[PDB]
Structures are given as structure tokens and as C-alpha cells.
Amino acid sequence: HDCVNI
Amino acid sequence: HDCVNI
Amino acid sequence: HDCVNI
Amino acid sequence: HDCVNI
Amino acid sequence: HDCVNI
Amino acid sequence: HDCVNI
Amino acid sequence: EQMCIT
Amino acid sequence: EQMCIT
Amino acid sequence: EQMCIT
Amino acid sequence: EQMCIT
Amino acid sequence: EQMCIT
Amino acid sequence: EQMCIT
Ligand SMILES: [Fe+3]
Ligand SMILES: [Fe+3]
Ligand SMILES: [Fe+3]
């Protein structure tokens, strides 16, 4: 899936 | 890479 | 309580 | 802008 | 799972 | 309430 | 829709 | 830290 | 469509 | 750190 | 729309 | 830690 780091 | 489509 | 609108 | 601090 | 419908 | 924990 | 930090 | 959809 | 934290 | 909807 | 973390 | 769209 498409993610971003947080 | 800071973004994802929603 | 801080918000965004999606 | 449509942002919150996390 | 740590999720919300958006 | 419908929440994620970050 | 509103998404809020508690 | 919690983010909730109202 | 969900936003999930991992 | 911020989350923004753009 | 996009969700972006900065 | 990641936020992912599923
Ligand atoms: Fe990666
Ligand atoms: Fe990477
Ligand atoms: Fe990457």
C-alpha cells in the first residue's frame, strides 16, 4: 500500500 | 516522499 | 482539539 | 492551509 | 489494526 | 469515537 | 469530514 | 496521541 | 479506503 | 511534524 | 486529495 | 512508524 513515514 | 493520495 | 477537513 | 501538528 | 475509514 | 492512535 | 487530534 | 473522525 | 498506522 | 491535506 | 507529512 | 492508505 501507499504510505508515509510519521 | 511526503505524500499519499486519498 | 485541532482538526483538518478531508 | 489544512494542517495539524502531530 | 489501527485504522479509520477515510 | 472512531480513532487511530499515532 | 473532520479529523481531529484529541 | 489520537486522531478521530468526528 | 482506510488510513492505518503501523 | 505536521499532517496536511492538500 | 493528498495527505502529506512534513 | 507509518501511515498507510489501504
Ligand atoms: Fe519504503
Ligand atoms: Fe524507505
Ligand atoms: Fe520511501
Swiss-Prot record, chains G, H, I, J, K, L:
Residues forming coiled coils: none
Reported modifications of this chain: The glycosylation pattern (the amount of mono-, di- and non-glycosylated forms or glycoforms) seems to differ in normal and CJD prion.
Compartments where located: Cell membrane; Golgi apparatus
Note: This protein is produced by a bicistronic gene which also produces the alternative prion protein/AltPrP (AC F7VJQ1) from an overlapping reading frame.
UniProt function note: Its primary physiological function is unclear. May play a role in neuronal development and synaptic plasticity. May be required for neuronal myelin sheath maintenance. May promote myelin homeostasis through acting as an agonist for ADGRG6 receptor. May play a role in iron uptake and iron homeostasis. Soluble oligomers are toxic to cultured neuroblastoma cells and induce apoptosis (in vitro). Association with GPC1 (via its heparan sulfate chains) targets PRNP to lipid rafts. Also provides Cu(2+) or Zn(2+) for the ascorbate-mediated GPC1 deaminase degradation of its heparan sulfate side chains.
Family: Belongs to the prion family.
Known partners and oligomeric status: Monomer and homodimer. Has a tendency to aggregate into amyloid fibrils containing a cross-beta spine, formed by a steric zipper of superposed beta-strands. Soluble oligomers may represent an intermediate stage on the path to fibril formation. Copper binding may promote oligomerization. Interacts with GRB2, APP, ERI3/PRNPIP and SYN1. Mislocalized cytosolically exposed PrP interacts with MGRN1; this interaction alters MGRN1 subcellular location and causes lysosomal enlargement. Interacts with KIAA1191. Interacts with ADGRG6.
Free-text comment about domains: The normal, monomeric form, PRPN(C), has a mainly alpha-helical structure. Misfolding of this form produces a disease-associated, protease-resistant form, PRPN (Sc), accompanied by a large increase of the beta-sheet content and formation of amyloid fibrils. These fibrils consist of a cross-beta spine, formed by a steric zipper of superposed beta-strands. Disease mutations may favor intermolecular contacts via short beta strands, and may thereby trigger oligomerization. Contains an N-terminal region composed of octamer repeats. At low copper concentrations, the sidechains of His residues from three or four repeats contribute to the binding of a single copper ion. Alternatively, a copper ion can be bound by interaction with the sidechain and backbone amide nitrogen of a single His residue. The observed copper binding stoichiometry suggests that two repeat regions cooperate to stabilize the binding of a single copper ion. At higher copper concentrations, each octamer can bind one copper ion by interactions with the His sidechain and Gly backbone atoms.
Protein name as it appears in the record: Major prion protein
Organism of provenance: Homo sapiens (Human)
